[PDB]
Design a binder for this molecule. Structure first.
Ligand code: MMC
Length: 330
């Protein structure tokens, strides 16, 4: 077992209480999962709420509350500049001042699943061992109830789309990102290829975080003992052979046949897309997120979006000749 801090990003919402109450209720050990609450903004009521938890958490305060000079295209986005400054300061605190080896980053509007800690404890060794991974996330971007298999709460995947929303990173990655941290829109900046460098994140079939106060993502409620499972299938070499053979070995169905629930005997199928317009159209037809960041679809892996549709496993996939993302798919 390893020590992994939880870094909570807070500011001016008193409801950080709900976030902390759930983290503290499910935390298995204070020693294994120290909680550090970084509060920006100087909102007095929120500070009093965090302080009331005492030694159960460590309360740190972003020091520079000044307004930030924004570029000419960003007059409406001061808040995004402040968020980026806060993340830079808080992550620096976690990795430089506290000297932790990794951290799970969570925002104050997230509620955790019962197995949130078990999940990160089990996946941290994979992140440490596989250089092709750069994070573990608790979030399934297409995680609404009707799109996930409730009988497979233990199932995990690789994704090229950095989901944020409860994510684990190594101190080594902060060393790489810190020198070029952006002025604003930090998460979309991490999604650019110049930052991602082809690396993936682990993500679950059923989300381990949910937002409150995205609202339709289902929070897992069945505890899965991930530390007792064999997660070797997530190693790049095994995954890229087996999961891909599975996707391309599955029968192909036209999107309208999947939409209307035709050929129900086929419990796992592939819907093939061929260009940006067909991807957007097919994703919309099947109720899957259709937006792309730097050409990567939500929850996509080698261009493949996997989800459940009317109880059937569906892989919305490009032709197997796929060889990289095109950022122009906007
Ligand atoms: C997870 Hg707050």
């Amino acid at each position: 077992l390893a020590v992994i801090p939880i870094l909570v990003i807070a500011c001016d919402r008193s409801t950080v209480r709900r976030c902390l109450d759930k983290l503290l209720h499910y935390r298995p050990s204070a020693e294994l999962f120290p909680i550090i609450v970084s509060q920006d903004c100087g909102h007095e009521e929120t500070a009093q709420v965090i302080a009331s938890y005492g030694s159960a958490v460590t309360h740190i305060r972003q020091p520079d509350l000044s307004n930030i000079a924004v570029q000419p295209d960003h007059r409406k986005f001061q808040g995004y500049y402040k968020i980026a400054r806060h993340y830079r300061w808080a992550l620096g605190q976690i990795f430089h001042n506290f000297n932790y080896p990794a951290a799970v980053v969570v925002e104050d509007d997230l509620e955790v699943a019962p197995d949130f800690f078990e999940y990160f404890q089990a996946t941290y060794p994979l992140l440490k061992a596989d250089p092709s991974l750069w994070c573990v996330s608790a979030w399934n971007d297409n995680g609404k109830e009707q799109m996930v298999d409730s009988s497979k709460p233990e199932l995990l995947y690789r994704t090229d789309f950095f989901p944020g929303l409860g994510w684990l990173l190594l101190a080594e990655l902060w060393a790489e990102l810190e020198p070029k941290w952006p002025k604003a829109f930090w998460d979309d900046w991490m999604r650019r290829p110049e930052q991602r460098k082809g690396r993936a994140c682990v993500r679950p079939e059923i989300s381990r975080t949910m937002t409150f106060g995205l609202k339709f993502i289902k929070l897992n409620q069945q505890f899965v003992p991930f530390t007792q499972l064999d997660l070797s299938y997530l190693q790049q070499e095994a995954y890229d052979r087996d999961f891909l053979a599975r996707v391309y070995g599955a029968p192909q169905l036209q999107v309208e046949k999947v939409r209307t629930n035709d050929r129900k005997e086929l419990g796992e199928v592939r819907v093939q897309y061929t260009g940006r317009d067909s991807f957007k159209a097919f994703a919309k037809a099947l109720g899957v997120m259709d937006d792309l960041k730097s050409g990567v679809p939500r929850a996509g892996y080698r261009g493949i979006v996997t989800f459940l549709f009317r109880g059937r496993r569906v892989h919305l996939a490009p032709p197997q000749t796929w060889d990289g993302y095109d950022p122009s798919w906007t």
